[PDB]
Design a protein around this nucleic acid. Structure first.
Lengths: 247, 302, 58
DNA sequence: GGCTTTCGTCAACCCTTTGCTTATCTTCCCT
DNA sequence: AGCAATTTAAATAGGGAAGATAAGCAAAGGGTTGACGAAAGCC
């Protein structure tokens, strides 16, 4: 027995489009799983999965180059060079209207759940982008599978993410089978021995290289199983769909 | 030391006619100006294509735009406004120095009989292309700055001497020799006959069900301004072995006859322009042809 | 991953995959960044990860 | 003894020019 | 002060002409976006 809260038409601008070194565009499912665990921390409603779809999404720039951001002189000790233009590190920006659907388990009324999600989203930040606007979130429940599809079709219109898996690698199949690659998680390289320059000193830290899976965009109504669009934190330091690989 | 023509050298049209609207009047009450509508008819016949003696009898249905005089009016009226513009050697896209040396190579061109041939082509009714074939008389009325001129019988092939064409051509050549402009409001009255068929200009349409599609201004039969202007500039009797006046072209070229009368005999416009800018003294007819091209207009470069 | 950047640029230029962005990493003079940025001055190929849009008029 | 400023150091390309998908609809039935 | 009738049939076919052309110029710029290493005054 499943419960969901849907925030439709989440207009967000200033999204850090740099998903990884080789992916620029839509934020991956690690971003929205991070947003889900962020509310698990601030609001206390513990979130299993998030199904996110893109209503609108434009990467700022041309069709072959992204619009770089005019950097500001914010480091310490480079005064005197501040009159000249700051050097640009690559961070593409994008705008996006999203539709989010969080699997939550809740025991109180739907009004306080909607208010808690609204108070989170008013202080949230989708992929480094300020949430410009969002409709009032609404609670829908998936008692059975037809009710699961009711929740699924309540995200209309949006293009959700379905996992199609890795055959050999990322570049090969992106040309061959023409699917989109995105960060489904990370791979740990080395333990980090210096916790002085970090957010926490006690949380263990690892250098990571983003693993990618290959995904497709399908409209949420054309997705047969809603579990193939709900991304959640898998126990391989990755994220994964509940329904597995989309067929 | 040859003065090469710039690639960007272009002259504008300095004889600008309007679209010649075609009305129907009687020969008596020419103020009863009723407009000739283009109708559309579909006509059955046979296909008689040169290389098809098999489709010969099968049949041929064609949708053609037609325009006719109404059966209560025997006179076609053609109304348009020629606009002779001066400043004829300032190329609006050309270089300064090449157009200046072409201007000071062509200051002594006889503009008088150039203007006479233009106004004669207006007055004899060459702007009526097929609308003159079959006509008891052709009356051309030209209003030139509050001065009405009347023209009854002028053979179009040769430029006969008369005082009214010369009178209009006086200020037309005064405009073409210097600054300013002159407007010629032309009204043609062809006594075609009761219910006679008139000939407007035809448009080119590529993927259309109409076999022939005439030019229509809000449904009214009309001639294209380029056809009227071609009939203005049909003054060239100065090419090699000239028998009839042809349109002033940079190559002396006509499309229907499939021959260029000035290509391959070093009498084309570009060779005489390079001669004018390099000290070759031009003849009077040769200067007049080059200046007629300069007021026809065109880009001459490369 | 450096192999991803270099091999992806070489492969997606080789296999004519033009659903991509191109970014010069080091800036004006990328030799202070990285040897691959120093030599491949034309920019690295990354995937254009834009999703399909929803047409508003429907 | 670092420390912060400014000047000197080290380079060198092969590019390509839209789709990705493509929207949540009536049979029985009796009141 | 509303009443205005019903059925029945709507044409078979043959044709939709080819031949010509579809300009040549000349332009299409760069200006900022550099991090380590090394002298070198300065707390």
């Amino acid at each position: 027995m499943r419960k969901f809260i849907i925030v439709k038409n989440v207009k967000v601008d200033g999204i850090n489009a740099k998903s990884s070194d080789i992916t620029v565009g839509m934020p991956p499912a690690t971003t929205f799983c991070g947003l889900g665990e962020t509310m698990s921390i601030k609001t206390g409603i513990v979130v299993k999965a998030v199904s996110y779809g893109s209503v609108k999404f434009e990467v700022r720039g041309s069709r072959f180059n992204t619009s770089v951001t005019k950097f500001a002189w914010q480091d310490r000790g480079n005064g005197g060079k501040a009159n000249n233009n700051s050097p640009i590190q690559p961070k593409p920006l994008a705008d996006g209207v999203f539709t989010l659907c969080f699997e939550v388990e809740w025991e109180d009324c739907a009004e306080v759940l909607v208010d808690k999600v609204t108070n989170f989203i008013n202080t949230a930040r989708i992929a480094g982008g300020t949430i410009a606007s969002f409709n009032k979130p609404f609670v829908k429940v998936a008692k059975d599978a037809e009710e699961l599809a009711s929740v699924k079709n309540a995200m209309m219109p949006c293009y959700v993410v379905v996992d199609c898996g890795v055959e050999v690698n990322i570049f090969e199949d992106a040309v061959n089978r023409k699917l989109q690659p995105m960060v489904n998680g990370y791979k740990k390289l080395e333990k980090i021995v210096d916790n002085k320059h970090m957010r926490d000193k006690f949380t263990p830290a690892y250098l990571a290289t983003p693993t990618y899976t290959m995904i497709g965009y399908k409209m949420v109504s054309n997705v047969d199983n809603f579990d193939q669009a709900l991304w959640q934190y898998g126990e391989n330091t990755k994220v994964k769909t509940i329904g597995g690989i989309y067929n | 030391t040859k003065l090469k023509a710039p690639a960007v050298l272009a002259y504008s049209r300095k004889i600008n006619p309007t679209n010649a609207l075609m009305f129907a009047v009687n020969w008596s009450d020419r103020d009863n100006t009723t407009a000739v509508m283009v109708g559309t008819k579909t006509v059955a016949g046979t296909q008689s294509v040169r290389g098809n003696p098999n489709d010969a009898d099968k049949g041929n249905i064609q949708t053609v735009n037609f325009a006719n005089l109404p059966h209560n009016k025997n006179t076609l009226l053609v109304k348009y406004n020629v606009k002779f513009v001066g400043d004829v050697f300032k190329a609006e896209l050309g270089g300064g120095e090449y157009s200046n040396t072409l201007q000071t190579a062509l200051e002594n061109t006889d503009f008088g009989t150039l203007a006479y041939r233009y106004v004669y082509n207006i007055a004899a009714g060459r702007t009526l292309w097929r609308n003159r074939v079959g006509a008891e008389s052709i009356e051309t009325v030209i209003t030139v700055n509050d001065q009405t001129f009347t023209f009854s019988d002028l053979l179009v092939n040769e430029f006969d001497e008369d005082v009214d064409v010369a009178e209009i051509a006086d200020m037309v050549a005064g405009v073409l020799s210097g600054e300013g402009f002159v407007t010629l409001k032309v009204e043609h009255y062809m006594l075609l006959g009761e219910g006679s068929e008139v000939f407007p200009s035809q448009e080119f349409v590529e993927n259309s069900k109409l076999s022939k599609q005439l030019f229509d201004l809000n449904g009214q039969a009309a001639m294209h301004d380029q056809k009227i202007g071609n009939a203005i500039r049909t003054i060239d009797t100065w090419y090699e072995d000239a028998t009839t006046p042809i349109a002033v072209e940079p190559y002396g070229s006509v499309v229907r006859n499939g021959v260029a009368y000035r290509a391959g005999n070093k009498t084309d416009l570009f060779t005489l322009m390079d001669g004018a800018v390099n000290g070759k003294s031009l003849t009077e007819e040769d200067q007049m042809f080059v200046t007629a091209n300069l007021i026809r207009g065109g880009v001459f470069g490369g | 991953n450096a192999h991803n950047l270099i091999s992806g640029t070489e492969y997606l230029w080789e296999h004519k995959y033009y659903n991509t962005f191109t970014q010069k990493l080091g800036g004006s003079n990328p030799q202070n960044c990285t040897h691959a940025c120093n030599k491949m001055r034309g920019g690295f190929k990354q995937f254009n990860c834009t999703p399909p849009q929803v047409e508003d008029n429907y």
